[PDB]
Structure formats: structure tokens, C-alpha cells
Design a protein around this nucleic acid. Structure first.
Length: 63
DNA sequence: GCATTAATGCATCCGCGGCCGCCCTGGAGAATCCCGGTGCCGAGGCCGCTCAATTGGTCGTAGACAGCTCTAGCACCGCTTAAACGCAC
């Protein structure tokens, strides 16, 4: 099983971590950076999607 | 034949009157909202693939922990001008 499931995170911690590793950012990356990044992206995406869905539903649309 | 004097054709200067345009009220017509109504098409649930996230071990390595060093920020003191404020035209 992946850490995202045991941490209840929808976004992939492993994918973010491997993006950071090959993203020429720092040679040493702690385990907290990928989980923090996944959490913040999940929060931002959730808020944006909720607002967009509100804007869609107030215009008689389901998309 | 010439002046002349009353009859006559207008002379041009007002008197009068035919001559309008603006607000307020009378509804009239175009635009909008909105879902039925049906045709269209793509969002996505399902099927099959595949590759890298996770696991464990190896191993070396950077940073918290003091630990110490020294250093300028600050609170304080008092002089010297020095602009800021209120006013007034």
C-alpha cells in the first residue's frame, strides 16, 4: 500500500516526491516536503473545484 | 400754341392676422426569460496493459547540540540648531 492511503491523501505523495527529486531543487529532500506539497495542492484544488462547481450550478449547468 | 387744373395710375408705409413651435398625456411595439423538444456527441465506466511506488538492506553523511566567542543595539545622558505649526493676507 502507498503512504497516501494510510495518510488519507488523494494526491500522490510518491509522484510529487519523484518530481521534486528530478526537478533540480535540492540534493537532499525530507519526507515532509512531498506530503506537505500533496496536502496543499489537494486543498487548493478542492477549493477551486468547489467554486467552479458553484459557478456552473448557478448557471443551470451540471458541467 | 402754352399753362393749367382736375382726373387718374399707381407710391410705398404701416394695420391687421395668418402663422407656427414646445410639455404632458395617450398607449403601442420590440426585446427578454424561460423551459419543452428533439437531435447530437463526448464523459466516463469498463477492459486490458505496464511500470514505478513500496520494501528492505547497505552506507555514508549533513545538521541539532551545545559550546564558545565577540559584538554592536539600545537605553541613557546632554548640547545645537531647525524645521513645523498656527496665523494672515
Amino acid at each position: 500500500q502507498s503512504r497516501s492511503a494510510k495518510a488519507g491523501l488523494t494526491f500522490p505523495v510518491g509522484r510529487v516526491h519523484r518530481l521534486l527529486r528530478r526537478g533540480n531543487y535540492a540534493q537532499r529532500i525530507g519526507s515532509g516536503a512531498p506530503v506537505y506539497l500533496t496536502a496543499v495542492l489537494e486543498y487548493l484544488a478542492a477549493e477551486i473545484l468547489e467554486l467552479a462547481g458553484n459557478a456552473a450550478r448557478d448557471n443551470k449547468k451540471t458541467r
